[PDB]
Amino acid sequence: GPHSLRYFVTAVSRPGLGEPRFIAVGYVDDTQFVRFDSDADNPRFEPRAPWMEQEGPEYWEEQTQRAKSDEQWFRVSLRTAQRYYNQSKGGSHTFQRMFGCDVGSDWRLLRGYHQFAYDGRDYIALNEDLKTWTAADTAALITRRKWEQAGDAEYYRAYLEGECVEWLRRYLELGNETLLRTDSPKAHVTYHPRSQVDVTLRCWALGFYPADITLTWQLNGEDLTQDMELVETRPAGDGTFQKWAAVVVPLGKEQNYTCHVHHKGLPEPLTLRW
């Protein structure tokens, strides 16, 4: 089965309040395992999963240093972006970075990531070839040309193919007890009175892992969505996830509606009724 290592890094400028906020979090699949928070009591790379408390000081010391390096460069980037777009020095802006790797069941690189955002919009992204860049605007075109000339792609690729994949395999060994699990969703349909003409059927999905799931309602074998309400997947808090989808249906014909659940842990997909 495939696995992913991902880091989500956020910098938020706040002039008149002080230095920019900087936070990095790491994930293995849908499981967080590390964090760095500039606003914490003692800012450092620290474990966020019990199986990471194994690693010694040489891990966290080196990780903390790398984070603080990026913190400084994220500060410059924020300033540079403000210059690029001719924005006011007084306003608060965001700079985001996501990177990591996807590996296949054969323990090899499937896809590497190195992409950036300004104020929640795409800025620049390392393409799937890990050689070329996609720039979202003409400002990012300036960045792209600078990073092309600097040879950044080969530098990132070196990490993505080597360091990223190897340490991911290490994490999958450290947390082999919990990370390699696959909890199929326990699903059901709930009845809730609405009007005197119709009723609400809420299809539930509980306690599943990973978080990737598919929930749909189909009437008489066809399909329905444009009326369907679908909340985004939510963490239960115990490492599992929840999700539901509801439909408004007239009285008496509830059993002509089928909820369909697709998930990694379900060999045969689920078909449910009230």
């Binding site: 790379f45 990780q63 990026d70 460069w73 410059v76 600078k146 530098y155 990132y156």
Partner: peptide
């Protein structure tokens, strides 16, 4: 493992 960016945008 965390990896750094080498410079600004």
């Amino acid at each position: 493992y965390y990896s750094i960016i080498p410079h600004s945008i």
